[PDB]
Amino acid sequence: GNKTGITYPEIKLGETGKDIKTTITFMNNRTDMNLDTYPGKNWKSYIEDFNKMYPNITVKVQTDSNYADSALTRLQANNDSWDIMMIPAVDKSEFSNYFVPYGETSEMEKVIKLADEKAYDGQTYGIANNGVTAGIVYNKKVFEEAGIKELPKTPEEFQADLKLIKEKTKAVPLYTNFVEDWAMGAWDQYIAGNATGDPKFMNQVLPTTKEPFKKDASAPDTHPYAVYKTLYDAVANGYTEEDYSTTDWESSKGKMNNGEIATMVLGAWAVPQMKQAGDHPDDIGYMPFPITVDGKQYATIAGDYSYGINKNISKEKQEASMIFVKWMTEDSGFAKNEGGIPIKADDESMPETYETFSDVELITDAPAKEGQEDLLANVNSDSELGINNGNGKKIQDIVVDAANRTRTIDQIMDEWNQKWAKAVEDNE
Ligand SMILES: OC[C@H]1O[C@@H](O[C@H]2[C@H](O)[C@H](O)[C@H](O)O[C@@H]2CO)[C@@H](O)[C@@H](O)[C@@H]1O
Ligand SMILES: [Zn+2]
Ligand SMILES: [Zn+2]
Ligand SMILES: [Zn+2]
Ligand SMILES: [Zn+2]
Ligand SMILES: [Zn+2]
Ligand SMILES: [Zn+2]
Ligand SMILES: [Zn+2]
Ligand SMILES: [Zn+2]
Ligand SMILES: [Zn+2]
Ligand SMILES: [Zn+2]
Ligand SMILES: [Zn+2]
Ligand SMILES: [Zn+2]
Ligand SMILES: [Zn+2]
Ligand SMILES: [Zn+2]
Numbered sequence: 001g002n003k004t005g006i007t008y009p010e011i012k013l014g015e016t017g018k019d020i021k022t023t024i025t026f027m028n029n030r031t032d033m034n035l036d037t038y039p040g041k042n043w044k045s046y047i048e049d050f051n052k053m054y055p056n057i058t059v060k061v062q063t064d065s066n067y068a069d070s071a072l073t074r075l076q077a078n079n080d081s082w083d084i085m086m087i088p089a090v091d092k093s094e095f096s097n098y099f100v101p102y103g104e105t106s107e108m109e110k111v112i113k114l115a116d117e118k119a120y121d122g123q124t125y126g127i128a129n130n131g132v133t134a135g136i137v138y139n140k141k142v143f144e145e146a147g148i149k150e151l152p153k154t155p156e157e158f159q160a161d162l163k164l165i166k167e168k169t170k171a172v173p174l175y176t177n178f179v180e181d182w183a184m185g186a187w188d189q190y191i192a193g194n195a196t197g198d199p200k201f202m203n204q205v206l207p208t209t210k211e212p213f214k215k216d217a218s219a220p221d222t223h224p225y226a227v228y229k230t231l232y233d234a235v236a237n238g239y240t241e242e243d244y245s246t247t248d249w250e251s252s253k254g255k256m257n258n259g260e261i262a263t264m265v266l267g268a269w270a271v272p273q274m275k276q277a278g279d280h281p282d283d284i285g286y287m288p289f290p291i292t293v294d295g296k297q298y299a300t301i302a303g304d305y306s307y308g309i310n311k312n313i314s315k316e317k318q319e320a321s322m323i324f325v326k327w328m329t330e331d332s333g334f335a336k337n338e339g340g341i342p343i344k345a346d347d348e349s350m351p352e353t354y355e356t357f358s359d360v361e362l363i364t365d366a367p368a369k370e371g372q373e374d375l376l377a378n379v380n381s382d383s384e385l386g387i388n389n390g391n392g393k394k395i396q397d398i399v400v401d402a403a404n405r406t407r408t409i410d411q412i413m414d415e416w417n418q419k420w421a422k423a424v425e426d427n428e
Pocket of ligand 7: 144
């Protein structure tokens with residue numbers, strides 16, 4: 001797919017491509033950063049900084065509120081109307097049908113983190129925008145008002161804390177952001193490394209296990225079941241917003257900052273957005289998801305959204321785009337600014353958000369065994385469950401079922417297991 005003859009490690013920022021005069025279109029999900037009133041460093045500011053180094057590469061930013069859906073639509077049009085996008089929910093095995101390979105994955109791992117996350121048949125097709133963990137954003141002042149002494153570490157402790165918040169404060173204990181598909185889909189981010197302690201769970205165990213959503217007999221407070229039951233119980237116990245059908249994401253930021261919401265299950269990228277949303281940044285904290293595995297808590301570090309380059313575009317625009325991605329990765333400061341972990345391989349600096357995480361084991365998803373790279377994507381597709389790959393609708397169903405008492409969490413998990421179990425069988 002690479003028309004340029006140049007791999008990503010071969011780019012010398014400030015020297016390579018300096019003769020290029022072109023314009024590239026950069027599609028991303030950060031509508032907030034596409035505004036002049038963004039409380040932080042917005043897209044225009046980054047592009048200005050980039051243009052000091054490459055003045056003749058003009059970068060045009062396009063942002064969509066319904067990002068996942070609109071990016072996939074543009075991808076399936078198979079044209080040259082975009083040059084860089086954040087990779088949406090695409091089968092790894094289909095990367096080469098859409099995206100320029102940055103380079104051999106073994107070479108990329110020398111210069112970026114998470115080089116095998118968006119890779120296939122030995123090539124890397126996406127670079128993460130920053131490394132994030134999945135945890136819980138919480139308001140420390142609301143927790144103090146509720147009398148919560150220590151952060152909850154099990155589902156039972158969490159529900160006990162939500163009840164204290166409900167009874168003793170005025171905050172919504174857990175705000176679901178039901179209306180945002182991506183906010184509901186985020187619950188899939190906790191069910192593997194966080195809920196099991198096993199870096200191989202996501203890419204090896206899950207797609208080879210017929211009923212992964214069943215309760216774990218030995219440790220019923222762990223594994224994916226415990227995650228989805230956390231959401232189920234919080235809604236069924238009356239510890240979420242009165243009306244899930246009318247939640248609002250943008251106002252939820254200000255409400256967290258001002259102590260009207262106590263918790264939201266979101267990745268670390270959300271911490272600066274909550275802190276910027278009002279006068280009480282110091283009241284925003286970040287905690288591990290409340291599962292303990294054999295006495296230890298775990299948090300997976302993963303890419304939030306990865307940059308991919310359109311294989312359909314000219315060699316000039318492919319190279320211009322790869323220069324901008326490398327600039328974003330190595331020079332921009334995006335990760336330092338959005339509260340995430342830098343992706344340049346040799347940068348071991350960490351957001352200050354990781355201070356309730358001193359005893360947490362930070363892990364990354366191991367690749368599948370050789371030849372199984374595509375197994376999760378294929379079981380996911382055939383099951384129609386879209387685990388960690390776009391499907392927030394099934395999580396909305398958890399909220400609906402728990403609020404209307406139509407089904408128990410067991411029954412919901414049993415439905416998923418039967419669909420997954422067939423997909424595991426069909427792909428073995
Ligand atoms: O990239 C982090 C998450 O962004 C989310 O989109 C938000 C965005 O962060 C910002 O808050 C904007 O104001 O609203 C967007 C939703 O329209 C989602 O894309 C999510 O999937 C990302 O993980
Ligand atoms: Zn939306
Ligand atoms: Zn959608
Ligand atoms: Zn596939
Ligand atoms: Zn090689
Ligand atoms: Zn192959
Ligand atoms: Zn106290
Ligand atoms: Zn407690
Ligand atoms: Zn009571
Ligand atoms: Zn929706
Ligand atoms: Zn297990
Ligand atoms: Zn004020
Ligand atoms: Zn305050
Ligand atoms: Zn169903
Ligand atoms: Zn079989």
